[PDB]
Design a protein around this ligand. Structure first.
Ligand SMILES: [Mn+2]
Ligand SMILES: [Mn+2]
Ligand SMILES: [Mn+2]
Ligand SMILES: [Mn+2]
Lengths: 491, 323, 83, 491, 323, 83
């Protein structure tokens, strides 16, 4: 017979001991551990909500891949990707390039806790999380690999994060800040709690649904499977936060959550928002990006923050408001600067789509609809040349994204500048500038693409030069997803 | 316009079609793209400095660590198929030996031997788990990291076996202290202090090269020969066929770790000067390994002989690598 | 050459716009309009474009030159429609 | 370490022994064994071409189901079956009802060899084949089970073979003759060699392709997986035949092959032929039923028959000729009598389709096209009542299928009658009558649907009564697949 | 018009939603639809007569055999998952015990014991394989047949283990005749003639009910207690831990066969008169089982005791079923 | 009642057709035509339908009755277009 798991589980995490041949601080350096004065004994109260043992893991994860890889091989020669909507295809290329290697990097972020966490239970769970991200990085390379002969863009699934293309810089800015350069406790909070439990756990659920709605079962199976692993290791932040509040560190806990959530939000506003409000066909849009955020992200954050004795971030209302603008600014930026990304941005501003947008965002056409009016007329009158840039947009020195906002009638674009130690910084929001000020030593000498351009680090110092600097060439350089098909509807 | 390739662009230049292993495991670390500023933040952050000092400035050098290849070519998908089979074997043993009451027929002398020399290893195994997971996050190439990734999982696997087994033992012999006394034994029994000092010091060797050497080349063979080989061989003799078989089943993982470690050293020896760098680290750590083996095996029956064989077998591991 | 950030009225994004230290607010505003007017902002012949520092709100004289307004490189300026 | 399979395989089949407490004939009764005078030692030369051991089997078959069931669950809620072409849907309903329980019955046919075969190697391979058909019967029940709430017709996946609906009688006639009532050696020949290796091995390959072409990946995965098992146990007949020829039984071997092949052909002409020439959309037709037969079935039979020292059946040329008629007769019969089957027969005689038919079968419209002309006019002129029967067609007393052939200009319908022991029998071909005559004691007192009707066993003795007798009611009763949509093309 | 149901029409009338097991295993035999003419051919064919006499006219009666349910509820899909796990365990044992040279340390006396009492079982196991596969094709219900289907696979499984193991033994002890002498031992060693007579006669009991009784209720418990329980228990004592564990692993399949056999008898006892029908068959076959056990176990060391325990344990199987 | 199998000219299938032992070949042919003409065989007013035993080919007289032709029940008969 076998023992019941509950009868022996505790022993698997009864691994802390009192160092003697080296000191505790030597064994667990604060910069990597982040125990923050809390005793080892106190960190031992850490108790993971989702437990799992080695044997259960290898068995269950074996079947998950058996299924995912079996689905992929069964539909392989079906070549769905060839008849899929360009908005969808673009959605996948953006997804893989932006995330494949960050998934792999997350295994190191997990390894950080697995090694330096004073909480024994956190160390084992992080070992499994490490294994999960290893899977995620690998499976999200194996799948897109199937399309490399279709377009060079699929090569960015692997190449993207190795380039200085602006979106790649933005991604690395986020990820490195949240998980690669933080102590163990900080990672469990900013990454597993704030980003995974807070955003991706649900996003992936919605992504898997859209893939299914798009007819891409291979991709839907992929995302669903990955999501089940995330739902498991994302739990690590909860207990860390309780322990910090439970002691004398509620402020530190609060500050990390505030930073983490805002940064996750910014990245989210450029990578997900545009997709559901413009790339997914109108008939396949369940809800708007704003609705999705409220019904599946904001209510949960408040829920969670309450159970932990934490407060809503000071920027919560602004955040609530920004759900009506930000992602529209990000989409317009990406589309207008489409040759600077590796996927084909879908305009999504046809008559049918334009009213859907006014319906979901009253006041859209009065503001955003304006910029799009000009762009549309130019295309109708044979002036494409005016729908692509001849300069670089101002980049935020925190989220490394373009500083944009409400245009047209209700114009309200602003720049929260800041001069620090003889240099001028630009921020796309109050929160972005705050993130910097509360911890300037962490971002001080970093330079965004524009800073580098202004410093002469991009040569030749012109558009063509900026493109080579970002490793972009015709073939991968983005253009309108539906090849301006949506223009015919305007005479 | 760029024409699509048949494989990843960084693999375009191979004579043979890339394997799944190469497709999902190569050139994935991006922190090595900017040695002057590994992470996309201020170049003076503590973590920026940690990677420059412990990864980039390691004396163990090579112009292309990304060229490393795992001889077993493990990927997550094949790692699980492999281990799920091995766990079906081990878990089957637990279940069926339990069924025939294997523990009840162990002698009192042996049960006490298990309390002192067997169950406390949960601390040493987790220590190796910590040791290898650190190698994971500081190694210069994704193919090297992955080997450390799977090895970490195996270490957690050994810990797990031990944890489960400690529970079963505490059930049939509740007065021995199984499950409760391991920590104090690991911390105070002279038989364990050799290994404890070794791993505690090894755990703070931050240089990726020295970490690899201290953990994979020196500490592990010493732990594997003492705890799996010797204690396991003794278990068989004393009528404990479960531990005898369990230890041999774990040796299989240990042998796989040796295989990739041997490959990494081989690659390292391609560059002039690395052999000397490795021998200097081995020369530094070997003395602690000897001490660990002596303190452990001497306390075992026919102790002196266990010491000679362990020392000999562990040194043979490095000899076969050219050192 | 002197770089400034253009936050053109009615547009959605602030952008990099190279100007000369000799240009006048009028000429600066003309270099900014190039990247906004007819690209994503309707012209307004019935009005005048003015240049004001975005931070404090200061409005500069049409004939005043970049070099006199002081300004910090990359300084953000609002280009607005007036009379 | 492990031994190489080749080092120990032989021992797994070194199981024959010399009985002592009972006699060999008692242990291996001739009626079940069919050793036919050949010694046990001589039967021991049996050597299977495809070997497999228990451990390999359970491991490989475990993964086959992991994949098939994983595909099915991933596409389940996608509900492809709801947007699939009616010809396809009908193809599946016909497939399941006609084969699910015959697949299960085949496990008993395998069990017959596993127990009564004097060849040790045949006994083990039959044990695995038994397991294969157990899988096939079960998996082909589990899959259609998913659609029972969509239509009662899906219930026939289980019910069909329990009824006296004519197609069910036809199927049981074939299967019971070939595998349920024959000695072990006879089963290995007539079933695994003649039917599986000869017809289904390739058919399933083509079926899986069409499913893929139809967009039904769940079904394509199903058929592909099953096919791999068949490809394995279908090998059993080869060695049996060699041993019989190798000794003094080439005639007996020849006679079984001739019978088996013709009967397989007849069933095949009604169940598969119509499907590929009329139910599969025109744009998805790779080749014609006749082409498929020549390129994938006839050449192989000759190939095989040569390697074994056997001759082509005496009816080979007629068979070759009949490829231009038979299945067209079966299709017209099924369609005209559509309310007597449980699926919706597709007419497949629209302009576009009619020339495809003339193209693949020159002289079609001159003959078959005639009957269809009248049927079409009647539908155009509001006389549907003349496109459904008011009588029963003459049923063959061997294959239990309607006696039909070339109509119209080149009219050539014939009936190979035979009076035996005071009774008149009807046969749809020379071969059908021969099958009966070479072994009359095997079919003598059997009665087909018409015989039963004429004997008063169907009451009330009219159409409505025949329908209840066959367990058919509105809802499952068949009608035109595309609801006469193809009629609009005729004014 | 007929409205679609939620389940198969023959299951429409259940309080709870049908399980996969019921969906794929119930009411599948169609030869029982026409007891006067089971097959769709002439009613006088030999096979028509065989099923009428051996299936339909069996004295073991019931109005609805299709109501039978396998207590383990095995379906092909779950049978393979289950056995693939067990084979990973057994094959793991083969591989790793081979690795530590388990066979080389067996004594000469034991090796000869293996030649006489162990390897010849490949004939008896295949005989059970034949015995159970016949039950498969003559049973009155598809749920009963399936149990016989999986049981047949297990018998082939035991044969296979034995075949593999005979090869390994012949490699380290080529002069014993492993692989070559089994047939003559099975046919002429007085130790085997008891079982041989039993199974040879049982193999010609064509009545499905008597076949079930002679094979599953009488012969199997006798074979399992003698070859798995006794010989396996002795193997453990003599230092052969491989056979000791192998036999116990097979006992798991044997125990599952007992579970469905017990369920079938239970169902049979619902009808008046069946208990008596079963006891009469048991009373007829039991004497041959006793003879088989005596001839086998008496030749083993401490033989008389092996006889008493085997007889007792096998009889207990039927007692727990109410006979 | 007497059953015969109708193999109507130009049709594709032979079918069951109940007739009377009194009917004449003409009336038999009329009962057969019912199940073929206008169902899947074009009429031919410019011709006459004849009844002949399918096996030996014998052609029966239009006015001859079923009972005289002998015939075995279920006997197959060809119904053909003539003059
Ligand atoms: Mn992940
Ligand atoms: Mn994650
Ligand atoms: Mn099959
Ligand atoms: Mn088959």
């Amino acid at each position: 017979s076998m023992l019941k798991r509950e009868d022996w589980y505790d022993l698997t995490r009864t691994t802390n001991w009192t160092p003697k041949y080296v000191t505790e601080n030597e064994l667990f350096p604060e910069e990597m551990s982040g125990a923050r004065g809390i005793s080892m004994e106190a960190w031992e109260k850490y108790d993971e909500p989702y437990k799992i043992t080695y044997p259960e893991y290898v068995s269950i994860q074996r079947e998950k891949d058996s299924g995912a890889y079996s689905i992929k091989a069964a539909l392989e020669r079906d070549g769905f990707v060839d008849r899929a909507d360009p908005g969808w295809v673009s959605t996948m290329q953006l997804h893989f390039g932006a995330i494949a290697l960050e998934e792999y990097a997350a295994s190191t972020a997990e390894a950080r806790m697995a090694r330096f966490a004073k909480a024994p239970g956190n160390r084992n769970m992080a070992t499994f999380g490490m294994m999960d991200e290893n899977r995620h990085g690998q499976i999200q390379l194996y799948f897109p690999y199937a399309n490399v002969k279709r377009s060079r863009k699929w090569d960015w699934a692997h190449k993207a994060i190795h380039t200085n293309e602006w979106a790649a810089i933005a991604a690395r800015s986020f990820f490195d800040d949240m998980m690669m350069t933080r102590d163990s406790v900080a990672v469990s909070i900013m990454l597993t709690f704030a980003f995974e439990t807070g955003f991706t756990n649900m996003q992936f659920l919605g992504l898997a649904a859209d893939a299914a709605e798009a007819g891409d079962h291979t991709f839907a199976s992929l995302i669903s499977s990955i999501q089940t692993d995330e739902s498991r290791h994302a739990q690590q932040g909860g207990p860390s936060l309780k322990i910090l509040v439970e002691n004398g560190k509620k402020d530190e806990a609060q500050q990390m959550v505030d930073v983490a959530i805002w940064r996750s939000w910014k990245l989210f506003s450029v990578l997900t928002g545009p997709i559901m409000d413009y790339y997914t066909p109108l008939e396949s849009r369940n809800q708007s990006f704003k609705e999705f955020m409220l019904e599946w992200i904001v209510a949960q954050f408040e829920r969670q923050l309450l159970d932990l004795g934490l407060d809503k971030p000071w920027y919560w209302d602004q955040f609530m408001q920004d759900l009506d603008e930000t992602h529209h600014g990000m989409h317009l930026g990406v589309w207008y600067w489409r040759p600077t990304v590796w996927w084909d941005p879908a305009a999504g501003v046809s008559p049918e789509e334009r009213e859907w947008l006014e319906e979901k965002y009253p006041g859209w056409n009065d503001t955003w609809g304006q910029c799009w009016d000009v762009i549309t007329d130019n295309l109708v009158n044979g002036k494409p040349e005016l729908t692509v840039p001849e300069t670089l947009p101002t980049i935020c020195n925190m989220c490394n994204l373009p500083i944009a906002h409400t245009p047209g009638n209700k114009w309200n674009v602003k720049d929260y500048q800041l001069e620090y130690e003889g240099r001028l910084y630009h921020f796309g929001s109050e929160a972005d500038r705050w993130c910097f000020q509360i911890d300037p030593e962490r971002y001080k000498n970093h330079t965004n693409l524009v800073d580098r351009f202004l410093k002469g680090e991009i040569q030749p110092a012109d558009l063509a030069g900026a493109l080579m600097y970002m490793s972009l060439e015709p073939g991968v350089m983005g253009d309108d997803a539906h090849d301006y098909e949506w223009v015919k509807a305007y005479q | 316009a760029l024409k699509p390739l048949k494989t990843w662009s960084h693999l375009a230049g191979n004579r043979r079609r890339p394997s799944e292993y190469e497709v999902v495991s190569t050139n994935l670390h991006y922190f090595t793209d900017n040695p002057e500023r590994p992470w996309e933040l201020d170049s003076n952050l503590p973590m920026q400095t940690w990677y420059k000092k412990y990864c980039f400035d390691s004396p163990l050098k090579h112009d292309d660590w990304n060229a490393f290849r795992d001889p077993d070519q493990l990927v997550y998908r094949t790692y699980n198929l492999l281990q799920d089979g091995q766990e079906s074997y081990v878990q089957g043993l637990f279940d069926q030996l339990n069924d025939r009451g294997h523990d009840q027929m162990l002698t009192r002398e042996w049960v006490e031997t298990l309390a002192r020399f067997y169950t406390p290893a949960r601390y040493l195994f987790h220590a190796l788990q910590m040791g290898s997971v650190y190698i994971h996050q500081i190694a210069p190439a994704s193919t090297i990291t992955n080997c450390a990734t799977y090895e970490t999982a195996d270490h957690l696997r050994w810990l797990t076996h031990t944890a489960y087994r400690t529970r079963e033992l505490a059930n049939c012999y509740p007065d021995v202290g199984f499950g409760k006394r391991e920590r104090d034994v690991w911390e105070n029994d002279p038989a364990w202090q050799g290994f404890r000092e070794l791993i505690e010091k090894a755990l703070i060797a931050w240089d990726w090269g020295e970490a690899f050497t201290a953990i994979n080349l020196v500490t592990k063979p010493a732990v594997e020969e003492a705890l799996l080989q010797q204690l396991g061989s003794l278990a068989q003799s004393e009528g404990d066929t479960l531990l005898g078989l369990l230890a041999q089943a774990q040796k299989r993982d240990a042998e796989r770790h040796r295989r990739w470690s041997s490959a990494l050293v081989k690659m390292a020896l391609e560059k002039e000067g690395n052999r000397e760098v490795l021998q200097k680290w081995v020369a530094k750590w070997e003395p602690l390994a000897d001490k660990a083996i002596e303190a452990y095996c001497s306390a075992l029956p026919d102790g002196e002989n266990a010491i000679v064989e362990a020392k000999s077998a562990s040194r043979y591991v490095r000899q076969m690598m050219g050192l | 050459t002197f770089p400034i950030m253009s936050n053109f009225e009615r547009d959605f994004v602030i952008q990099l716009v190279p100007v000369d230290t000799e240009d006048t607010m009028d000429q600066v505003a003309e270099k900014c309009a190039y990247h906004s007017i007819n690209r994503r902002v309707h012209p307004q012949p019935e009005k005048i474009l003015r240049v004001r520092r975005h931070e404090d709100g200061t409005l500069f004289p049409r004939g005043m030159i970049v070099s006199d307004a002081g300004l910090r490189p990359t300084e953000t300026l609002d280009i607005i429609f007036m009379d």
